[PDB]
């Protein structure tokens, strides 16, 4: 019924099929589909996810208008993605006045001052990582980076969100470690999410059946655990994401007990695989380019002599490490996309955007577009050198998004990732094993993950 919207506005795009739109074009994934449409349609094109029209914009000025300028007025919320249950109070899922209240009451939790107080806690499990890394290195066999980084990210999440101190690699039995290990990213091209994308009318049916997109067993366990910790913390009468929220609940509007639980889980969901996935991507690019690995290891030793422990100020000093992280995020933006919902009829940069249309920014396509990048398929971390760090457009390179709805944990994630990278590199060096796919291929699903898990030879330095 709504498949003729983009034709009447003179907007190019793939011709849609009845009842499906262009979901069949997802056979290569969102990343490949967006890049092909960028080459075959220019700067602005459109497509349909079932009956939902999606407009893709690549003009940096338009991206600025959608994400920053007209964010509060028009482009405020993301598209609904399925039955959420009580998790509708999550900040990433909240909409309109609920989101603005929640972000205002949660912004101080991610301050630079509070982050400097969280560095020592994250540093403790960096030493835990190298201990398990040494045993894996002494074996003489290749090591999958997803598991060692997942154990590290899980350890950081448990100690930052709560007061739980666990070695996940050697103790995969605590209830925190078990349930949280199932908090993986959403494959939006799997049979379930594909079915709800074509059948959005089934989302309310799933909600009334108490069928939540998140595992119900994990959510109920975590909610009860917070209730146990909230009472136990009172009996003990701190640097915790929970404690910072508790210190805000007692002193816009207030924050509810169920809201605090919902935001606590979303932090785990936002950090478990995302941190580990980027860490695996970073180490793979260092192994195949040892010149970058050598210079980064030399820079780490210069700022931190004699294998010194990292500090908040020292992490921000290391420049080449920031270049490695940024360039890897350019090649692999694990979000792959940025989406906003147009809540009203509006014209942006001389273009009419009707209400209800989802506006999408192809982060992966822009990050590998030749117009803004030279040899985009190569791992050249020098693109972000201080002299060359200004030529890049901040709205073509959006790994953490932009505007008031960007990643609220960008500073925490960058510090957590960099703290791990300093410790592992100054003690270990990584070489490509035989099982490593030198031309590593990306998965064809809804996740920006490699086709095969990255395996790399590891040795003591
Ligand atoms: C490597 C790790 C991470 C990456 C690459 C990443 C990237 C992103 C991206 C691309 C967005 C979308 C922003 C946009 O729509 O404009 C986002 C949103 C968000 N992220 Fe992250 N993120 C990471 C980790 C985290 C962590 C660990 C937390 C929590 C402690 C977090 C909290 C959030 C929140 C709350 C939002 C939604 C903000 C809003 O709705 O106002 N992120 N992130
Ligand atoms: O916004 C993203 C985009 C993204 C970012 C990185 C990797 C993959 C992806 Cl797809 N994901 C996300 C979604 C939700 C929810 F509840 F709406 F489903 C909650 C939290 C996050 N999140 C992840 C990282 N930081 C925040």
Q: Where are the domains of the chain?
A: 1-461
Helix axes 257-288, 97-106, angle to 10 degrees: 70
Residue nearest to atom 40 of ligand 1 (CA): 92
Give distance in angstroms: CA of 401 to centre of ligand 1.
8
Sort 435 into a burial class: Cβ within 10 Å, 0-12 / 13-18 / 19+. Answer: middle
Q: Is the CB of 333 under 6 A from ligand 1?
A: no
Q: Which residues pair with 340 in a beta bridge?
A: 359
CB 330 within 8 A of CB 25: no
Residue nearest to atom 19 of ligand 2 (CA): 92
Q: Where are the alpha helices (DSSP H) in 54-202?
A: 60-64, 97-106, 112-138, 145-161, 175-180, 191-198
CB 433 within 8 A of CB 455: yes
Q: Is the dihedral of CA 159, 165, 171, 176 positive or negative?
A: negative
For the CA of 88, the nearest ligand: 2
CB 261 within 8 A of CB 255: no
Task: Give the largest Cα separation in the chain, rounded.
Answer: 68
Tokens 């594909």 label which residue?
Answer: 194
**Kind of pairing between the strands at 358-361 and 338-342:** antiparallel
Q: Is the CB of 408 under 6 A from ligand 1?
A: yes
Q: Where are the alpha helices (DSSP H) in 289-396?
A: 290-303, 312-317, 319-331, 363-367
Give distance in angstroms: CA of 333 to centre of ligand 1.
12
Q: Is the dihedral of CA 13, 15, 18, 19 positive or negative?
A: negative
Q: Which long-range contacts (CB under 8 A, 24 or more apart) does 251-259 make?
A: 252/100, 252/101, 252/104, 252/105, 253/101, 255/102, 255/105, 256/89, 257/227, 257/230, 258/86, 258/89, 258/223, 259/89, 259/102
Sort 391 into a burial class: Cβ within 10 Å, 0-12 / 13-18 / 19+. Answer: exposed
CA angle 201, 12, 396 (to 5 degrees): 90
Whole-angstrom Cα distance, residue 20 to residue 8?
A: 19
Q: What is the resolution of this structure in A?
A: 3.0
Query: Which residues belong to the annotated binding site for heme?
Result: 407
Q: Is the CB of 268 under 6 A from ligand 1?
A: no
Select from 329, 331, 304 the least CA-distant residue to 315: 304
Structure tokens at 234: 């009172």
CB 266 within 8 A of CB 90: yes
Q: Is 85 left (phi over 0), alpha (psi -120 to 50) or beta?
A: left
Please enumerate in sequence order all residues whose Cβ is within 8 A of that of 428, keeping only pairs 6 or more positions apart, or say none: 130, 133, 137, 458, 459, 460, 461
| DSSP, res 185 | P
Give distance in angstroms: CA of 217 to centre of ligand 2.
21
Please enumerate in sequence order all residues whose Cβ is within 8 A of that of 440, keeping only pairs 6 or more positions apart, or say none: 284, 450, 451, 452, 454
Atom of ligand 2 nearest to the CA of 448: 8
Q: Using only C-alpha atoms, what is the Rg of the chain?
A: 22
Atom of ligand 1 nearest to the CA of 399: 10
Name the structure determination technique. Answer: X-ray
Sort 295 into a burial class: Cβ within 10 Å, 0-12 / 13-18 / 19+. Answer: middle
End-to-end distance of the chain based on CA atoms, in angstroms? 64
Give distance in angstroms: CA of 302 to centre of ligand 2.
35
CB 166 within 8 A of CB 152: no
Q: Is the CB of 271 under 6 A from ligand 1?
A: yes
Atom of ligand 1 nearest to the CA of 67: 16
Please enumerate in sequence order all residues whose Cβ is within 8 A of that of 446, keeping only pairs 6 or more positions apart, or say none: 29, 30, 186, 187, 188, 189, 190, 193
**Kind of pairing between the strands at 52-57 and 358-361:** parallel
Task: Give the SS3 label for residue 387.
Answer: coil
| DSSP, res 202 | G
Select from 193, 118, 130 the least CA-distant residue to 159: 118
Tokens 């971390």 label which residue?
Answer: 381
Sort 302 into a burial class: Cβ within 10 Å, 0-12 / 13-18 / 19+. Answer: exposed
Structure tokens at 104: 């205002």
Sort 118 into a burial class: Cβ within 10 Å, 0-12 / 13-18 / 19+. Answer: buried
Structure tokens at 162: 């709560």
User: What CATH fold (topology level) applies to the domain 1-461?
Assistant: Cytochrome p450 (1.10.630)
Structure tokens at 281: 């991507």
Please enumerate in sequence order all residues whose Cβ is within 8 A of that of 354, keeping only pairs 6 or more positions apart, or say none: 5, 9, 342, 345
Q: How many H helices and E strands in the chain?
A: 17, 10
Q: Phi then psi for 66, rounded to 5 degrees?
A: -70, -45
CA angle 370, 374, 375 (to 5 degrees): 90
Select from 130, 461, 450, 460 the least CA-distant residue to 284: 450
Residue 456 vs residues 274, 275, 321: alpha-carbon distances, Å: 20, 18, 20
Give distance in angstroms: CA of 271 to centre of ligand 2.
9
CB 354 within 8 A of CB 11: no
Whole-angstrom Cα distance, residue 295 to residue 289?
A: 11
Pocket test for ligand 2, best of 266, 278, 405 (most atoms within 8 A of CB): 266
Q: Is the CB of 102 under 6 A from ligand 1?
A: no
What element of type H or E holds 258? helix 257-288
CB 2 within 8 A of CB 53: yes
Select from 155, 178, 226 the least CA-distant residue to 420: 155
List, chain by chain if needed, residues with CB within 6 Å of any ligand 2 atom. Answer: 90, 92-93, 185, 266, 269-270, 274, 334-335, 407
């Amino acid at each position: 019924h709504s498949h003729g919207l983009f034709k009447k506005l003179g907007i190019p795009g793939p011709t849609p099929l009845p009842f499906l739109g262009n979901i069949l074009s997802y056979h290569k994934g969102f990343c490949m589909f967006d890049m092909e449409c960028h080459k075959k349609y220019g700067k602005v094109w459109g497509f349909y996810d079932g009956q939902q029209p999606v407009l893709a914009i690549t003009d940096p000025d338009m991206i600025k208008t959608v994400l920053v300028k007209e964010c509060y007025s028009v482009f405020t919320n993301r598209r609904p993605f399925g039955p959420v249950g009580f998790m509708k109070s999550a900040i990433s899922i909240a909409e309109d006045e609920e989101w603005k209240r929640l972000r205002s009451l949660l912004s101080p939790t991610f301050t630079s001052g509070k982050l400097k107080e969280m560095v020592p806690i994250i540093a403790q499990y960096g030493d835990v990582l190298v201990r398990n890394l040494r045993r894996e290195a002494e074996t003489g066999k290749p090591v999958t980076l997803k598991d060692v980084f997942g154990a590290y990210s899980m350890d950081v999440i448990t100690s930052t969100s709560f007061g739980v101190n666990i070695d996940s690699l050697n103790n995969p039995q605590d209830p925190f470690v078990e349930n949280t290990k199932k908090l993986l990213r959403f494959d939006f091209l799997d049979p379930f999410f594909l079915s709800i994308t074509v059948f959005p009318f089934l989302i309310p049916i799933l909600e009334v059946l108490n069928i939540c997109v998140f595992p119900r067993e994990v959510t109920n366990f975590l909610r009860k655990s917070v209730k146990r910790m909230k009472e136990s913390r009172l009996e003990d009468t701190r640097v915790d994401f929970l404690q910072l929220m508790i210190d805000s609940q007692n002193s816009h509007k207030a924050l509810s007990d169920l809201e605090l639980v919902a935001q606590s889980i979303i932090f785990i969901f936002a950090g478990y695989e995302t941190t580990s996935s980027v860490l695996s991507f970073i180490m793979y690019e260092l192994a195949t380019h040892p010149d970058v690995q050598q210079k980064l290891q030399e820079e780490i030793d210069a700022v931190l002599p004699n294998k010194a422990p990292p500090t908040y100020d020292t992490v921000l000093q290391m420049e080449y490490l920031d270049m490695v992280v940024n360039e890897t995020l350019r090649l692999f933006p694990i979000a792959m996309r940025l989406e906003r919902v147009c809540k009203k009829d509006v014209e942006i940069n001389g273009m009419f955007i009707p209400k209800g249309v989802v506006v999408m920014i192809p982060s992966y396509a822009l990050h590998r577009d030749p117009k803004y990048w030279t040899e985009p398929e190569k791992f050249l971390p020098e693109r972000f050198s201080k002299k060359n760090k200004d030529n890049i457009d901040p709205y073509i390179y959006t790994p953490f998004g932009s505007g008031p709805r960007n990643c609220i944990g960008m500073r925490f994630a960058l510090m957590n990732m960099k703290l791990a990278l300093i410790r592992v590199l100054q003690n270990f060096s990584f070489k490509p094993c035989k099982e490593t796919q030198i031309p590593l291929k990306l998965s064809l699903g809804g996740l920006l993950q490699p086709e095969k898990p990255v395996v790399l030879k590891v040795e003591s330095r």
